[PDB]
């Protein structure tokens, strides 16, 4: 049977400059629209009606302060479809109401699905194991937990991260002040996975480059390599002895080493995603109850834990009125927490 | 401080006083460690994806490598053939030496910039300040996300070391 | 009537060290939150 | 300090049960030929 399905399959999988595949039908429109929506919004669209913020090059923002901001809190978790009951097909109103935010987040989610299907698809055609796709599950877990699950647990999309550099920084500081997220052991594991991943990256790269075999005469050692050579280009034995004597332990199995490099950052991102799922419900690691009971009763007891809560209290009170305009917080000067003089 | 919550205290007060999130060297540092972890899982996944079959399904594939063996344990051509098609051919390495150099250089250079951000904010050359940068026709301040960051920073500033300041400016 | 599907199981010494280090570090991390 | 007193047995079983599992598997690997 060589019907139309098999002929389409032929054309989709042609060896061209940009491989397409069946996955490309999902991947390419969704990725392109998510990116086009972000450039369109950051260049032309305001956040005046949803946040009280300017947020585009058109309004005078720069690369650090432009964003596609989340919709107004009054939108709830509305899909905000262009043809839905809020914008009612009006493209201009849709932009002013935050429709570009759900547009980017939803086309982005489906684009990420498409990229992982592409990793599977290409891997199956070339005949390699699909561990690159398996590793990409960690970015997907992060995107889904931070941009979808977290606001879905909260009151509305408004509290999701906005798509911009400074808007994401506000998101980091909100998470310190309100959730005490640095204290969360699931974030801690994520940090260990990210910094340990950076470390493994640097040390393995540096180790290969400094246990190279002399396979050429030039002072530039890059040329002395051939992609089809059967020999290892560097000495695992010398590398193993160096680290055993510098650090005490060393890799001896090159296959374990490279699996470990997959494992560490991927597991770290997965752990951080679990903690954010908890923050969706405000299920924080905010306090140590034992510390609070002692400190309530003993005004001489002070730790770095109690010092940081005072900072969190400052963040909440000073940023909430501007950051949550729909709440209409009026905090007179006399109620604002402040230290002496400042 | 030499402790876990003391680290967080240092980071929070640093943001209040130098706006480190808005300094390009901390931003390069983040690119360094986010990129380092990306390339770490990247290299890990490609090499693991192209391990030459040397074992049965009931044993660990790790036994297919023997310490000190002369021959490579994976097929870099197959790895290049997969990753070149994932992006495009010329976005993929086929020289292992320059691949491993890029793995070395990217996080190391990024962390150099991160350390230089801390070292130069030690002398109070702080992150970008766009507080009240956008002004309307009458002169009303139009807030941006930078101004929301400033509100959070003010809260950290006014509470930190709450008994330690007698005069209005926290100059060091 | 011996079942043909049985297979010996292995844990090498480096895996034991790795496993014990993971468990002890996880305990050292989570213990503070267990005591609260 | 008023800590949760279940924290003790929770930590102890957290270390012991998986550590013991690993030791059983390792020792019976050594004893194979």
């Amino acid at each position: 049977e060589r019907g139309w399905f098999d002929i389409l399959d032929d054309w989709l999988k042609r060896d061209r400059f940009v491989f397409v595949g069946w996955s490309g039908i999902l991947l390419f429109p969704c990725a392109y629209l998510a990116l086009g929506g972000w450039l369109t919004g950051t260049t032309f669209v305001t956040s005046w009606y949803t946040h009280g913020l300017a947020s585009s090059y058109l309004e005078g923002c720069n690369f650090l302060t432009v964003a596609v901001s989340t919709p107004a809190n009054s939108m709830g978790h509305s899909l905000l479809l262009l043809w839905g009951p809020e914008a009612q097909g009006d493209f201009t109103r849709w932009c002013q109401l935050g429709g570009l935010w759900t547009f980017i987040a939803l086309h982005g989610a489906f684009g990420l699905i498409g990229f992982m299907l592409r990793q599977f698809e290409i891997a199956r055609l070339v005949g390699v194991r699909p561990y690159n796709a398996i590793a990409f599950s960690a970015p997907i877990a992060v995107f889904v937990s931070v941009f979808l699950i977290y606001p879905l647990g909260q009151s509305s999309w408004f509290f999701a991260p906005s798509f911009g550099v400074a808007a994401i920084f506000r998101f980091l500081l909100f998470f310190q002040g309100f959730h005490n997220w640095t204290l969360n052991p699931f974030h801690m594991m994520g940090v260990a996975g990210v910094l340990g991943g950076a470390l493994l990256c640097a040390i393995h790269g540096a180790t290969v480059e400094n246990t190279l075999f002399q396979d050429g005469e030039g002072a530039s050692t890059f040329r002395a390599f051939n992609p089809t050579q059967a020999e290892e280009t560097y000495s695992m034995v010398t590398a193993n002895r160096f680290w055993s004597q510098i650090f005490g332990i060393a890799f001896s199995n090159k296959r374990w080493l490279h699996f470990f490099m997959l494992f560490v950052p991927v597991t770290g991102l997965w752990m951080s995603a679990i903690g954010v799922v908890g923050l969706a419900l405000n299920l924080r690691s905010y306090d140590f109850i034992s510390q609070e009971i002692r400190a309530a009763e003993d005004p001489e007891f002070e730790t770095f834990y109690t010092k940081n809560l005072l900072l969190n209290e400052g963040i909440r009170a000073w940023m909430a009125p501007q950051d949550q305009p729909h709440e209409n917080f009026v905090f007179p000067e006399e109620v604002l927490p402040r230290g002496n003089a400042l | 401080p030499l402790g876990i919550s003391g680290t967080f205290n240092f980071m929070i007060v640093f943001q209040a006083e130098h706006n480190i999130l808005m300094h390009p060297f901390h931003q390069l540092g983040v690119a360094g460690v986010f990129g380092g972890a990306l390339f770490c899982a990247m290299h890990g996944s490609l090499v693991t994806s192209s391990l030459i079959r040397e074992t049965t399904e009931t044993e660990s594939a790790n036994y297919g490598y023997k310490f000190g063996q002369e021959e490579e344990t994976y097929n870099i051509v197959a790895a290049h053939g997969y990753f070149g098609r994932l992006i495009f051919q010329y976005a993929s390495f086929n020289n292992s030496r320059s691949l491993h150099f890029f793995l070395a250089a990217w996080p190391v250079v990024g962390v150099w910039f991160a350390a230089l951000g801390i070292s130069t904010m030690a002398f109070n050359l702080n992150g970008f300040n766009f507080n009240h940068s956008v002004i309307d026709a009458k002169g009303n301040v139009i807030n941006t996300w930078a101004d929301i960051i400033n509100r959070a920073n003010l809260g950290m500033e006014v509470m930190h070391e709450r008994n330690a300041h007698n005069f209005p400016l926290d100059l060091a | 009537e011996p079942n043909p599907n049985r297979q010996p199981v292995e844990l090498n010494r480096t895996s034991l060290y790795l496993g014990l280090l993971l468990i002890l570090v996880l305990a050292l991390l989570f213990s503070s939150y267990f005591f609260n | 300090m008023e800590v949760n007193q279940l924290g003790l047995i929770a930590t102890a079983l957290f270390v012991l049960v998986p550590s013991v599992f690993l030791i059983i598997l390792y020792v019976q690997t050594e004893s194979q030929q």
Binding site: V237, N240, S244, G248, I249, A250, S252 | K66, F67, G68, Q69 | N12, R13, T14, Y17, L20, L21, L24, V25, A27, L28, S31, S32, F35 | M1, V3, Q5, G7, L8, T11, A12, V15
Partner: peptide, 30 residues
């Protein structure tokens, strides 16, 4: 109780370092 627990776990890790360095499986070339 909680202080003893923290130090005990820590002390086990330092002991584990010792065995992992000095009583490792030797790497053997082939």
């Amino acid at each position: 109780m909680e202080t003893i627990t923290y130090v005990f776990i820590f002390a086990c890790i330092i002991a584990l370092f010792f065995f992992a360095i000095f009583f490792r499986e030797p790497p053997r070339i082939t």
